[PDB]
């Protein structure tokens, strides 16, 4: 797995992570990408999408496995423990999921990155997030609960 | 000894090596030289010669000892074992001496770099190389066996 922080002013401001099929960088924030191999790659950002085009030589291509439909409620391994929910983002503990750690992938226990967080700072006594994943049939759609800011 | 790979796209494409008297870089291939001290040195390439001018401060000057005439057939320490031949380049093992490792010096067992390889990919069930060294009286001449490509 290659999940890389983004270098801004010599400190971490983002967190770039490569995914199956295409290499991914969260283009919501800026900062020089730490990896030198990615340091010479053109940027392809859409109006609302903040994703890097996959231009890694196909030796290390598809570092991960993408995620299909049929979301279970079960455990998804997160950087800070497992997450367990199905209707929307898991009720992450308070304090966790704040700010400054943009671009963190939530993966299945089977190695299938279910979604990519793009904010969702607080959602009450619990907290869900604003993320993007396949819609129902494999459509890269973002869902943003109200009160969502990059985390 | 300072033998340095050449940095192209953040991976090794060449192999620069400093020699007695003058600092050497194989200018046949390109790529940013890894060493910062060499990163600010002008380039002096001839029509057929791919050698860097020696512009290192004379503190580390003459890192090696050059090689005189009277080639013995004996062992010359190579990056991949010793080499033993006199008429031409040693019958290197098959598979060894392929491509991508340009700029590798062959040294005497006494610390005297007999020649510098500049290709010679394959020469049959054995393999010799295309190299450059003193001719007979100390003349920097290249010999290229037929079927020679940079290695």
From Swiss-Prot, chains A, B:
The active site is at 28 (charge relay system), 50 (charge relay system), 102 (charge relay system). The modification Phosphothreonine is found at residue 3. Phosphorylated on serine and threonine residues. Residues 44-49, 136-140 are annotated as: Interaction with spike glycoprotein E2. It comes from the Viruses. It is found in: Virion; Host cytoplasm; Host cell membrane; Host nucleus. The record marks 76, 109 as: Involved in dimerization of the capsid protein. Residues 2-151 form the Peptidase S3 domain. Forms an icosahedral capsid with a T=4 symmetry composed of 240 copies of the capsid protein surrounded by a lipid membrane through which penetrate 80 spikes composed of trimers of E1-E2 heterodimers. The capsid protein binds to the viral RNA genome at a site adjacent to a ribosome binding site for viral genome translation following genome release. Possesses a protease activity that results in its autocatalytic cleavage from the nascent structural protein. The very N-terminus plays a role in the particle assembly process. The N-terminus also contains a nuclear localization signal and a supraphysiological nuclear export signal (supraNES), which is an unusually strong NES that mediates host CRM1 binding in the absence of RanGTP and thus can bind CRM1, not only in the nucleus, but also in the cytoplasm. The C-terminus functions as a protease during translation to cleave itself from the translating structural polyprotein. Homodimer. Homomultimer. Interacts with host karyopherin KPNA4; this interaction allows the nuclear import of the viral capsid protein. Interacts with spike glycoprotein E2. Interacts with host IRAK1; the interaction leads to inhibition of IRAK1-dependent signaling. Part of a tetrameric complex composed of host CRM1, host importin alpha/beta dimer and the viral capsid; this complex blocks the receptor-mediated transport through the nuclear pore. Interacts with host phosphatase PPP1CA; this interaction dephosphorylates the capsid protein, which increases its ability to bind to the viral genome. This is Capsid protein. It comes from Eastern equine encephalitis virus. The lineage of its organism: Viruses, Riboviria, Orthornavirae, Kitrinoviricota, Alsuviricetes.
